[PDB]
Amino acid sequence: SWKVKEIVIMSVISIVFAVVYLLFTHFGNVLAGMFGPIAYEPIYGIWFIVSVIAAYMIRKPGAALVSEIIAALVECLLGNPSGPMVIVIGIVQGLGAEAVFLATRWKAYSLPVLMLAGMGSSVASFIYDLFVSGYAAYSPGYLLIMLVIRLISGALLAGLLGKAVSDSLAYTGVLNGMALGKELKKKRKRASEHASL
Numbered sequence: 001s002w003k004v005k006e007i008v009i010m011s012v013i014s015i016v017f018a019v020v021y022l023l024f025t026h027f028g029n030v031l032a033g034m035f036g037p038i039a040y041e042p043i044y045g046i047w048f049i050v051s052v053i054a055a056y057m058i059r060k061p062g063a064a065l066v067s068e069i070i071a072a073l074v075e076c077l078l079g080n081p082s083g084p085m086v087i088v089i090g091i092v093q094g095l096g097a098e099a100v101f102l103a104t105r106w107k108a109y110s111l112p113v114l115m116l117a118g119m120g121s122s123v124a125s126f127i128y129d130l131f132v133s134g135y136a137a138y139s140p141g142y143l144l145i146m147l148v149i150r151l152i153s154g155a156l157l158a159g160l161l162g163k164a165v166s167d168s169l170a171y172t173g174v175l176n177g178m179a180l181g182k183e184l185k186k187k188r189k190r191a192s193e194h195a196s197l
């Protein structure tokens with residue numbers, strides 16, 4: 001059962017990373033223009049990181065989905081050049097990540113599950129692009145290479161990097177009200193019990 005503070009902290013994270021998303025979107029446009037779509041595939045997973053952060057921190061159903069929606073909304077508001085369609089891909093990416101936490105009953109937050117969640121967004125956004133972003137015009141080889149790159153980027157820049165960011169925050173103390181903060185507390189109590197006089 002969600003707490004007010006969790007809903008609130010999830011929003012602040014979404015908002016902050018909306019700014020990051022927008023910066024990378026600008027990069028991606030320049031890259032696409034110069035070298036074609038494959039050029040932004042390596043950084044693609046950054047646009048999923050909010051889902052992993054919110055889920056790993058809060059560990060309740062809907063975190064991955066809602067956090068990404070809010071981040072996409074705010075990125076749109078801040079001036080994403082593609083307008084509201086970024087909110088659609090945001091919804092799609094959030095559903096892709098959420099599906100992995102659904103599949104593991106919102107009880108599993110090991111790195112492999114976080115990476116899978118990232119990859120879920122990779123797959124969902126790739127489906128979206130085949131409908132909307134002109135990907136259907138490309139060859140099997142090009143598409144296959146881009147999907148593979150996007151899958152790796154989702155695993156690394158959302159899953160792994162998302163865990164690293166979250167852990168770093170947990171170490172500041174600011175997540176002490178959250179599941180991840182509680183986990184750190186438990187681990188620290190365990191480690192403290194090794195002290196001897």
Ligand SMILES: Cc1ncc(C[n+]2csc(CCO)c2C)c(N)n1
Pocket residue numbers: 021025028040047071072075086089090093125129133
């Ligand atoms: C929240 C969010 N913001 C920006 C992107 C970037 N983006 C939207 S569409 C498109 C081209 C088709 O892949 C790219 C690079 C994203 N994926 N998710």
